[PDB]
Every structure is written in C-alpha cells, then in structure tokens.
C-alpha cells in the first residue's frame, strides 16, 4: 500500500509558527492539531459547532485553523431519517477562529468504531461522509442500503439480520415490535455485529 503523507494540514497563512497546544481556560483540556473541538455557536440554545483543529497559532492571542464539521440539519439537504443523532459530515469548509471560542473537546469516531462503543457519551460523534459545503455533494456519493425501506444504516435504530439474506431489517418494517425482536432466538426473513461490519452493495 503506497500513499503520501501531506506535510501541512492547513493552506492558509502557513507563514506563522505553530503552537504545539492550547489549554482551554480554567480546565485541564489540552487541544492539539488533529483534535476535534466544540465551539459556541452564534445563535443561543443551539448545539455547539464541531470542528477539527488543523493548526494552532498566536499573535502579539491564540488562533485556530478549523475544518468545520456539519450537522445533518446544518447541511444543504438537511437531516434525513437515516442520519444518526451524533452523525457529522467532514466538510472542506475552513475558517480561522479565536481559540477562546473553544468550549470543550469531543471525539469524532469512524462509523465502525462508533458502532462498537460500549457507551455513547455526550462527546462521542461519528462521521462517514465528507461534504462539499459549496455544492452539498457527499463523498462517497453511494452507500449500502438495507431492509424493505431500502435505507442506509442508522446506528440509532435496532436492526436484525436474516439468517438467509444477511440483509438487515427494522423490526417495524417486518411487522414486529422492538421487544419481540430483542427476544428472538433466530430470525429468517420472509424474502427468504452491525451493518457497518458488512461488505457488499451500494446505492446513491
């Protein structure tokens, strides 16, 4: 496997010297390049902005080069039913912000790693899509779909796998309650671990 290792993460104002880190005022929370952070939004009462810290720099104080994450509702197409509560899109939208706008730290997991968390905390997010903020285009533009409803996997929703198709199903879509599904010894579907751990067939 041959791949490159880009020397710089931010293209803006490469002229400054990098700070190794920045500590959130009054806390033990240390922010470094590569970390993801929560920032106070303009509008009050709304969830904080999530960003990846690409670079830290100061003047004569401290500035951070942010690569914005977009919440599904913040995106051009809005939130769809298959988007998880903690789902984020990694955008190509960059900004320079005062480091003082940083509220706290968070972790933006890979989808697979997110589904394997034994406990999802307030700081735990995930990302499976990159997002072109100027157009609203997604990468990848095609994802696997499941069930009768032919939808992408929403990690928030319980699904059961058929012992025939290996396809996954929402209980409600196959006419059963969540409790009934949870009680099952087996399941073979009428057409006949998580979908994140499946390797197969893709749709736009």
């Amino acid at each position: 496997m041959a791949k490159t290792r880009p020397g710089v993460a931010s293209k803006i104002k490469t002229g400054r010297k990098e700070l190794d880190s920045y500590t959130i005022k009054g806390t033990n929370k240390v922010v470094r390049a590569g970390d993801c952070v929560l920032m106070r939004p303009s509008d009050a009462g709304k969830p904080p902005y999530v960003a990846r810290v690409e670079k830290i720099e100061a003047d004569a104080n401290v500035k951070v080069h942010c690569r914005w994450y977009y919440r599904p509702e913040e995106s051009l197409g809005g939130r769809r039913q298959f988007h998880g509560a903690k789902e984020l899109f990694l955008s190509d939208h960059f900004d320079v912000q005062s480091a003082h706008t940083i509220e706290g730290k968070c972790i933006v997991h890979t989808f697979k790693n997110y589904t394997r968390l034994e406990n999802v905390g307030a700081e735990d997010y995930y990302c499976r899509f990159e997002y072109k903020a100027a157009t609203g285009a997604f990468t990848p533009d095609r994802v696997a779909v499941y069930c009768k409803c032919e939808m992408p996997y929403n990690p928030d929703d319980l699904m059961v796998q058929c012992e025939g198709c290996k396809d996954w199903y929402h209980p409600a879509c196959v006419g059963m309650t969540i409790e009934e599904a949870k009680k099952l010894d087996h399941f073979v579907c009428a057409e006949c671990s998580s979908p994140a751990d499946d390797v197969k067939v893709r749709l736009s």
């Binding site: 920032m39 106070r40 939004p41 303009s42 902005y49 955008s91 939208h93 900004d95 003082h100 706008t101």
Partner: peptide, 8 residues
C-alpha cells in the same frame, strides 16, 4: 467567545 463562520 462566540464563533462566526465564514460563508462556504
């Protein structure tokens, strides 16, 4: 303390 995003 509030952050302001540029327009994409």
């Amino acid at each position: 303390k509030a952050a302001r995003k540029s327009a994409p």
